[PDB]
């Protein structure tokens, strides 16, 4: 029993974190086989922040300009190249700790673990979701650039995020590991802002199922609704539309608890229209949307506490 915002164990990723210094700029890199991946911003100059032609900046560089430190061992850079907004630094030593891994790009609404890092040294691990507006609500300070986000599947690390910058609202933007930004953001200090966000409806429903599995049932009711009437109310509360695929994905949870998806939707409708009236769900006084159906199944017992 119990439900927490759980991250993946970070060990496999800790063993790939290195420090990359170019000039007076230091940030984190990801060392996999004989390549170190890091934000290309490492080559940017303090005055170039506004608009840095990275192609020129990289042309002006040589391998010896990149200081790469794996803990106490310096790695010799033997090649450098740019891939969109990340830089690939070939080094003369393959990381003996390289896990099995993949570079995957995730969808808004999916979750992942973040290993926050400073000077190549892991600092903390936490879970979050890719927001509908392609930002993440992370916890990052200066120096965290190059920290990565990931999901672990049978000892295989799927890297999905590299941290690049903080937007004016204090939320965070970055790239996949091919260096392509999530959302309409660029690696220059401009007036870019997050667009309007929405709540991830399928996740809220998954979390309500988690709550039932854990014995919170006060929000349940005898009513059911149709997908369209539900989505009509969702729109009015700035919730993503619920699709039939979401209903299908919630199937297993619906079977475990005996509560049909459209019945749970009627509960969500009431909570949106009425609030929680003094009450909490799984320790929260807000409807939580950063737990996918998969996260719930993985964390929660296969047996419901009836």
């Amino acid at each position: 029993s119990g439900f927490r915002k759980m991250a993946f164990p970070s060990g496999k990723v800790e063993g790939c974190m290195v420090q990359v210094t170019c000039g007076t700029t230091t940030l984190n890199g990801l060392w996999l086989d004989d390549v170190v991946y890091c934000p290309r911003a490492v080559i940017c100059t303090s005055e170039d922040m506004l608009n840095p032609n990275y192609e020129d900046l990289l042309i002006r560089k040589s391998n010896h300009n990149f200081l790469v430190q794996a803990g106490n061992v310096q790695l010799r850079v033997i090649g450098h190249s740019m891939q969109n907004c990340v830089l690939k630094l070939k080094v003369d030593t393959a990381n003996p700790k390289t896990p099995k891994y993949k570079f995957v790009r995730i969808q808004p609404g999916q979750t992942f673990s973040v290993l926050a890092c400073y000077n190549g040294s892991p600092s903390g691990v936490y879970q979050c979701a890719m927001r509908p507006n392609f930002t993440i609500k992370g916890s990052f300070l200066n120096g965290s650039c190059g920290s990565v986000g990931f999901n672990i599947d049978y000892d295989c690390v799927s890297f999905c995020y590299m941290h690049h910058m903080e937007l004016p609202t204090g939320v965070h933007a970055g790239t996949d590991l091919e260096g392509n930004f999530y959302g309409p953001f660029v690696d220059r200090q401009t007036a870019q802002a997050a667009g309007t966000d929405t709540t991830i409806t399928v996740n809220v429903l998954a979390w309500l199922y988690a709550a039932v599995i854990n014995g919170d049932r006060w929000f349940l009711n005898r009513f059911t609704t149709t997908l369209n009437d539900f989505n009509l109310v969702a729109m009015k509360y700035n919730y993503e539309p619920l699709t039939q695929d979401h209903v299908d994905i919630l199937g297993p949870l619906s079977a475990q608890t005996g509560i049909a998806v459209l019945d749970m939707c009627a509960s969500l409708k009431e909570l949106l229209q009425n609030g929680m009236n003094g009450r909490t769900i799984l320790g929260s006084a807000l409807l939580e949307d950063e737990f996918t159906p998969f996260d719930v199944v993985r964390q929660c017992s296969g047996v419901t506490f009836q």
Binding site: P39, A41, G143, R188, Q189, T190
Partner: peptide, 9 residues
């Protein structure tokens, strides 16, 4: 007001 690249100097 303006975006912040989070390197370290």
């Amino acid at each position: 007001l303006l975006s912040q690249l989070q390197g370290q100097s």
